[PDB]
Structure 1
Amino acid sequence: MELLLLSNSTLPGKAWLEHALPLIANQLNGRRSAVFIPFAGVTQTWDEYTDKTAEVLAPLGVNVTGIHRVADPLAAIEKAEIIIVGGGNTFQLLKESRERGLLAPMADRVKRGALYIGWSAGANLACPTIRTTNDMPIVDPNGFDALDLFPLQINPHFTNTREQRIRELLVVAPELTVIGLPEGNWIQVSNGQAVLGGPNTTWVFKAGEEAVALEAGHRF
C-alpha cells in the first residue's frame, strides 16, 4: 500500500502543502486522477477547499476533483488513482464519510492500489479509529472506527497534558501504539515500508512504556 500521512498542511512561512510536494511527486508513480474529500472542512466551503489542492497538485500531474462536485461519488472513488483527505474537524470528516457510504469504498480503493494522501484529520482517518484526534466532538460520527489502513494510532499536531490524555487512552485500550506526530512531520508508507520523516521529534506511546523519541527515517 501507498499512503502519505502528514501531521499538517503548512509549515510556518511556507505555502499550504509545500513541504508535501516533493513527497507526493516521489510517490505518484504516474498516477493522475484524484478525488479530494473535503468533509473535515467547517469554516471554508468545500468547493473552495478543493481548489488550493488542485492548484499545487495540478503541476505534479494530479487532476483533483472534489467528491462533493461529482454525480456518483462512489464511482468516482472506485475509479480514482489517488484519494486526498484534507484537514479540519475529524468527527465531521468521519460522520460525512460514513453517512455518504464512502468509508469502506475509500479503504477498498486504497487496498486495491490507490495512493492515499491525508493531512491532519485526513491522517487520523487512515488509522483504525479516530480515538487520538485533538478535535472537539462537534458532531457524532456514529462510530469511531475509521479506514483502518495504517495500523497504528496517529495523534497529529503533537506537542506536550497531551501525553496524559494519551495515557488514559492506553488504560482503556492497552494494545494500542500511539504516535505523537508533530507538525512538520509525516509517515510515508510505500513499497512495504512505513517510514517516519520530518525535522521535529516524534514520540511513540505504548501501555506501560516510557515515551520513545523516534528519529527521521525510523521504520515502523
Structure 2
Amino acid sequence: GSELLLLSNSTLPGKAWLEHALPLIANQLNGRRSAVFIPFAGVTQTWDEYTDKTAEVLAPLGVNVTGIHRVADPLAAIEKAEIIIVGGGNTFQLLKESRERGLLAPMADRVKRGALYIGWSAGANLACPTIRTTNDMPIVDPNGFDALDLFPLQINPHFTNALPEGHKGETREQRIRELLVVAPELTVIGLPEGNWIQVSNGQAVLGGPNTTWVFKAGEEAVALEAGHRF
C-alpha cells in the first residue's frame, strides 16, 4: 500500500541531474504537488542550496518543494506533505539527523498513510529496514542502523562488482556476502547505476536498462532485468 520511487543514483552519464527520474515521478504523482525535502545526506553543499536545486528540477512537474530544515515545525510539515523527497549524500549523516530530529517515525507513518516517497542513493538506503548495505564511509555515528523500513529488502545502490586494476580490496559481492553471514535471512538487491525500484499500486517493479543482482545466503547471485516484480 506504499508509493515509493527508489533510485540507485541521481544522474545518468551525459544527462542532467535527476533528468531520468522526472518521467517516473510525473507518472506517479497522481495529482500530488506538495513536497517536503529531506536534505540531511548533503555534506559538501548547504542544505539550502540542495533544497533550491531540488525545487528547480521538480518545478516543471508542478511540485512545490519545502526544505524540512527551514520550517518552524518539521513534524507538521511532514504531516501535511503529499511527497517526501530524500536526497543522496552520506547515508550516515542522513540517518543521524533524521533520528536526532525525531523524523523517522513521522516520515514512515506519513508514507504508510499514502504520501509518495522519492529517494535516490542515500535516500534509497533510508527506505530499507536498515542502512547496512550503504557504500558510504561512517563519518558520523547515527546511533543505530535501523531506518524507515518502507521497503522490505536491502538495497545496495551504485552496484558494481568491478574494481580498479590490481586492487586487492573486497569486491562489492564479497562485502555483501559478509552481511549475509551475520544476517542470513536478508535479501540484498545490487541495484546498479541507472536503475530504480518503483513501488506503486501494490507492485514493486524493477526499472532501468542495466542488470540487477539479487544476493541471498548460500545462493549464487541472480540476474534480474527491468520489469521484474518483487
TM range (shorter): over 0.9
SS of equivalent residue, structure 2 residue 197: strand
The alpha carbon displacement at 1:61 in A equals: 1.2
SS of equivalent residue, structure 1 residue 18: coil
Residue 215 of structure 1 pairs with residue 225 of structure 2? yes
- Report the RMSD for the aligned CA atoms in angstroms: 0.4
Unaligned runs of 5+ residues in structure 2 are: 162-170
Q: Deviations over 1:48-68 (max 9, x none)?
A: 000111111111111000001
Q: Deviations over 1:76-99 (max 9, x none)?
A: 001100000000000000000000
The alpha carbon displacement at 1:167 in A equals: 0.2
Q: Which runs of 4+ in 1 moved over 2 A?
A: none
TM-score in terms of structure 1 length: 0.99
Distance 1:186 1:218 in 2: 11
Distance 2:172 2:57 in 1: 33
The alpha carbon displacement at 1:69 in A equals: 1.0
- Kindly report which structure 2 residues correspond to 1:175-190, keeping only aligned pairs within 5 A, or say none: 175-190=185-200
The alpha carbon displacement at 1:155 in A equals: 0.2
Query: Which residue of the other structure, out of 191, 204, 208, is the alignment partner of 2:214?
Result: 204
Distance 1:61 1:191 in 2: 22
The residue number in structure 2 matching 1:78 is 79
> Percentage identity across aligned positions?
100
SS of equivalent residue, structure 2 residue 96: helix
Residue 159 of structure 1 pairs with residue 160 of structure 2? yes
Unaligned runs of 5+ residues in structure 1 are: none
The residue number in structure 2 matching 1:173 is 183
Distance 1:154 1:179 in 2: 5
Q: Deviations over 1:145-182 (max 9, x none)?
A: 00000000000000000000000000000000000000
Distance 1:198 1:215 in 2: 8
SS of equivalent residue, structure 2 residue 202: coil
The alpha carbon displacement at 1:111 in A equals: 0.2
TM-score in terms of structure 2 length: 0.95
Distance 1:43 1:25 in 2: 29
Distance 1:108 1:205 in 2: 29
SS of equivalent residue, structure 1 residue 205: strand
